[PDB]
């Protein structure tokens, strides 16, 4: 299947004292593999998956240098954007950045992206052509002009189509045992009486990877959304994910209802029925 490498960065300003809190996370697909936290003791990029620990000192020194460089850019930007928006020095504000690259089943480049946000709203983003920028307002338009003059998109494109993909492939091979394994959802149904005439059926998907999944209910072979509840997909804490979907049904009619589970690790979708 397809794969991605993505880095996420958050900086939060601290007007009362000191420098911004800065947290960086790197992922391959849905697996976190590195982190940096300005509040942590190491002041280094740190490993979070066994298959990255084999990288040598030059890797860790370089990733620490670069992630600190990201943090300083964010710090500068928090000041600059406070000025663009004519905001007080007394408030805390946030910059968020996400970039990365996707490859297809053949491990060839599919797409790249670089998104930047201020106070939780779109600020500037690289378009899918990897040449142009989308600026949400006139402050971001000022940034866009700066980044055009500095030819940022050209350097970013070269990374996204080259280095990003090449290192993603390296990680996919080094971490093959887990990164190239799909964990199909372990599925079951539970039944809960909610009155003399109503019952709830809850369809469970547990311990699955990657996180993408679809759970749907049908009644007598037709999709039903009325009287259903679908929770957000949530982390188990061991690298896998969980989800459930529930439906309220007249007691005694449980057999009409089927839960349908689609996931990359299933050759065919699963159908569950309370029988």
């Amino acid at each position: 299947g397809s794969h991605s490498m993505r880095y996420f960065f958050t900086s939060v300003s601290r007007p009362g004292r000191g420098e911004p809190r800065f947290i960086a996370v790197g992922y391959v697909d849905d697996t976190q593999f590195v982190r940096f936290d300005s509040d942590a003791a190491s002041q280094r990029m740190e490993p979070r998956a066994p298959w990255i620990e084999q990288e040598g000192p030059e890797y860790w020194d370089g990733e620490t240098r670069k992630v600190k460089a990201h943090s300083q850019t964010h710090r500068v930007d928090l000041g600059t954007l406070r000025g663009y928006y004519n905001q007080s020095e007394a408030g805390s504000h946030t910059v968020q950045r996400m970039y990365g690259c996707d490859v297809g089943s053949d491990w060839r480049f599919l797409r790249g992206y670089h998104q930047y946000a201020y106070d939780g709203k779109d600020y500037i983003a690289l378009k899918e052509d990897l040449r142009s920028w989308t600026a949400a307002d006139m402050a971001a338009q000022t940034t866009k002009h700066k980044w055009e003059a500095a030819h940022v998109a050209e350097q970013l494109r070269a990374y996204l189509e080259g280095t990003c993909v090449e290192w993603l492939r390296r990680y996919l091979e080094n971490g093959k045992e887990t990164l190239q394994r799909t964990d199909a959802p372990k599925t079951h149904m539970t039944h809960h009486a909610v009155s003399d005439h109503e019952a709830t059926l809850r369809c469970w998907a547990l311990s699955f990877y990657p996180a993408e999944i679809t759970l749907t209910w049908q009644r007598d072979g037709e999709d039903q959304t009325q009287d259903t509840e679908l929770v957000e997909t949530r982390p188990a804490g061991d690298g896998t994910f969980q989800k459930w979907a529930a439906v309220v049904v007249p007691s005694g009619q449980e057999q009409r209802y089927t839960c349908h589970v689609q996931h990359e690790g299933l050759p065919k979708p699963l159908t569950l029925r309370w029988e």
Binding site: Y7, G26, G62, E63, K66, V67, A69, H70, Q72, T73, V76, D77, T80, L81, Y99, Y116, Y123, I124, T143, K146, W147, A150, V152, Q155, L156, A158, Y159, T163, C164, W167
Partner: peptide, 10 residues
């Protein structure tokens, strides 16, 4: 691997 090219300021 992180991007290295200059993290252009806004």
């Amino acid at each position: 691997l992180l991007w290295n090219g200059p993290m252009a300021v806004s």
